[PDB]
C-alpha cells in the first residue's frame, strides 16, 4: 500500500533543531573507529553507520541527531536527510520498545504470514502501523527479511523468530512484555534452515584439511 509516512519535516516541540541530542563519549570512540575504516578525504562514507549509531543511542532519529551527524562528518545536512529518508531501517518518528516487523512477501505469505499478523494484532489490540498505549510495541509489515526457508518469521530488535505459529508469536510477546529474553531462531524444534525430515545431507563427518588438494600446491 501507499506509504502513510511523510518525507517533509515540520518542526515540532517534540522534534526540532533545539531538541537535545549528543553522542556519548563511548559512542564518540565508536564513531572514531567507524571513520578510521575509510580512506582520507572520503569521510562521508561513514554517514550510514554513524547515523545508525545515533538511532542505537536514541531509539529514533530526531532532526537534531541528523544535524549533529552532518556537523560531525563535515557533510551538508541535506545529504544526511537524503540518507535518513531513503533507508527504511531509520526511524524518523519514535517507535515502541519492541519494533515487531512481519514479513508478508510471497514466500512468507504462502506459509500463512496472515495468521501471524492477525494473531499479533489480536494479542496487542493494535494495527499494522500503530504503537501500543504503553509504548512497548510497534507493529509494521516488511519485505523479505531473508529467511524465506524458515517462513513465516518475524524480526524484533535485530532478532529473528522463525517457523512461527500464532501460539508461538503470542508466547514470544508474553515473554517480551514480562522483561524476559526470548531466544531467537526457529520454534518448530528445528535449529536452522535444515530439512525437518532428518538431515537429507551433510550426515557424514566433515573431512580434514588437505583432503582434496591437487598436486603441486
Amino acid at each position: 500500500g501507499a506509504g502513510g509516512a511523510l518525507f517533509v519535516h515540520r518542526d515540532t516541540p517534540e522534534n526540532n533543531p533545539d531538541t537535545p541530542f549528543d553522542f556519548t563519549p563511548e559512542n564518540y570512540k565508536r564513531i572514531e573507529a567507524i571513520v578510521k575504516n575509510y580512506p582520507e578525504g572520503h569521510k562521508a562514507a561513514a554517514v550510514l553507520p554513524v547515523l545508525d549509531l545515533a538511532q542505537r543511542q536514541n531509539g529514533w532519529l530526531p532532526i537534531s541527531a541528523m544535524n549533529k551527524v552532518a556537523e560531525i562528518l563535515q557533510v551538508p545536512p541535506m545529504r544526511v536527510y537524503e540518507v535518513a529518508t531513503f533507508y527504511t531501517m531509520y526511524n524518523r518518528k519514535p517507535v515502541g520498545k519492541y519494533h515487531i516487523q512481519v514479513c508478508t512477501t510471497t514466500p512468507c505469505m504462502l506459509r500463512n504470514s496472515d495468521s501471524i499478523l492477525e494473531a499479533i494484532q489480536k494479542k496487542l489490540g493494535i494495527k499494522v502501523g500503530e504503537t501500543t498505549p504503553d509504548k512497548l510495541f510497534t507493529l509494521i509489515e516488511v519485505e523479505c527479511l531473508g529467511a524465506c526457508v524458515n517462513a513465516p518469521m518475524v524480526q524484533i530488535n535485530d532478532n529473528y523468530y522463525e517457523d512461527l505459529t500464532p501460539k508461538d508469536i503470542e508466547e514470544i510477546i508474553d515473554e517480551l512484555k514480562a522483561g524476559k529474553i526470548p531466544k531467537p531462531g526457529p520454534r518448530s524444534g528445528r535449529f536452522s534452515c535444515e530439512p525437518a525430515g532428518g538431515l537429507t545431507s551433510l550426515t557424514e563427518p566433515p573431512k580434514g584439511p588437505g583432503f582434496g588438494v591437487q598436486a603441486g600446491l
Binding site: 562521508a44 557533510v75 551538508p76 541535506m78 545529504r79 537524503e82
Partner: protein
C-alpha cells in the same frame, strides 16, 4: 489597447545566410547592424567524473 504608428513594427524577414540578408538590406537602402552567429562551444562530458577519486568533480548526490 496598445497603439502604434510605424508600419514596420511587425516586419521580420528570414534568410539562409548573413550575406543574403546584407544584400537584401543594401538593395533596399536600409542601414543595417550585423551580429555574428553565436554557436555553443563543444564541451567535454564525462559521466565517470561524477565519482572521481581525488578531484572536486565528485558529486555528493545523484
Amino acid at each position: 489597447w496598445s497603439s502604434t504608428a510605424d508600419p514596420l513594427s511587425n516586419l521580420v524577414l528570414t534568410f539562409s545566410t548573413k550575406e543574403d540578408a546584407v544584400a537584401f538590406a543594401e538593395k533596399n537602402g536600409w542601414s543595417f547592424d550585423v551580429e555574428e552567429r553565436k554557436v555553443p562551444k563543444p564541451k567535454s562530458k564525462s559521466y565517470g567524473a561524477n565519482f572521481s577519486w581525488n578531484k572536486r568533480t565528485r558529486v555528493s548526490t545523484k
